[PDB]
Amino acid sequence: GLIYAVGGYDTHLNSVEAYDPERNEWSLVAPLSTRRSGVGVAVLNGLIYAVGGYDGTHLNSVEAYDPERNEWSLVAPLSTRRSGVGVAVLNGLIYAVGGYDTHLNSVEAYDPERNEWSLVAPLSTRRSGVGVAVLNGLIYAVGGYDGTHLNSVEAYDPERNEWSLVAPLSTRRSGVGVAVLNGLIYAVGGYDGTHLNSVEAYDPERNEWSLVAPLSTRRSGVGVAVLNGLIYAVGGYDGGTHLNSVEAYDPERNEWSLVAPLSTRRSGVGVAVL
């Protein structure tokens, strides 16, 4: 039950720090074997996978972190180098959605029992710096950048292996952080230029986005994760200054509040909870 901030950009970072919410403290853990900015991270079977990133060199390598042993271990690489890639876990598979190499619309799925990536149905739109979240058995690709900053959102159904467009964002968001809490998808910050502090929440029962309380600080390239009923916006870029500040969102009060800051400024950071 800790928030991990993996990589990012200060220099391109290989360090990783973990957050204890009960103590409100950030602590260093084992660093990545490679510097990774714009990296996608996800949790599957008690392991944190750091997917792709940028060192320059756009990376195709993936490494897995064991929190019980405090060790990063290399696994099978992606078929395509991806930076600014969105990743998520659904039904025991890790999906690497989009990214930049050329801006990518292809999606690969990782099977940990086979240690092999497999191409699945591609997106309808090229998306780099895209936010990816999972809700109700679907994978949502939220915003991104088409090399045009995107407000459209597509949902992936693994039973049909196809993407379909849903209600788009009210504001275009690239480098946006997304997370799921209480059956809602939150789109946190991003870039539209104007670096965004606004947050939108998507209700699948209504197929509609709605504005919620905005961040106290404008955040692009921000990492977002959910822990103990709260949403944490970790780091980002305020265009400028790179951010070490961390804000927590309470859905019951609809309020963002500052918590302990990171030990290092991280933009384009991957954030996960384990």
CA distance 221 to 224: 10
> Sign (positive/negative) of CA torsion 200, 145, 264, 271?
positive
Residue 246, judged by CB atoms within 10 A of its CB (0-12, 13-18, 19+), counts as: buried
* Residue 94 φ then ψ, to 5°: -105, 125
Q: How many structural domains are present in the chain?
A: 1
In angstroms, how far is CA 199 from the centroid of its own chain?
Answer: 15
Q: Which two tokens stand for residue 265?
A: 């400024």
Contacts for 233 with CB less than 8 Å, ≥ 6 apart = 177, 188, 189, 215, 219, 222, 223, 224, 246, 247, 248, 249, 256
Q: Which residues of 108-137 are buried (b: 16+ CB within 10 A; e: fewer)?
A: bbbebeeeebeebeebebbbbbbbbbbbee
Contacts for 194 with CB less than 8 Å, ≥ 6 apart = 218
**Residue 19: which CATH number?**
2.120.10.80
Report whether 90 contacts 69 (CB < 8 A): no
This structure's resolution (Å) is 2.0
Q: C-alpha angle 179/214/8, rounded to 5°? A: 55
CA distance 2 to 98: 27
Which method, experimentally, gave rise to this model? X-ray
The residues facing 28 across adjacent strands are 17
Maximum CA extent, the chain: 44
* C-alpha radius of gyration, the chain, whole number: 17
CA distance 250 to 22: 16
The residues facing 4 across adjacent strands are 18, 272
Cα separations in angstroms, 175 against 12, 30, 95, 212: 17, 26, 18, 19
Residue 81, judged by CB atoms within 10 A of its CB (0-12, 13-18, 19+), counts as: buried
Structural domain span for residue 82: 3-55+57-273
Report whether 206 contacts 221 (CB < 8 A): no
Residue 31, judged by CB atoms within 10 A of its CB (0-12, 13-18, 19+), counts as: middle
Q: DSSP string spanning 109-159?
A: EEETTTTEEEEEPPPSS--BS-EEEEETTEEEEEEEE---EEEEEEEEETT
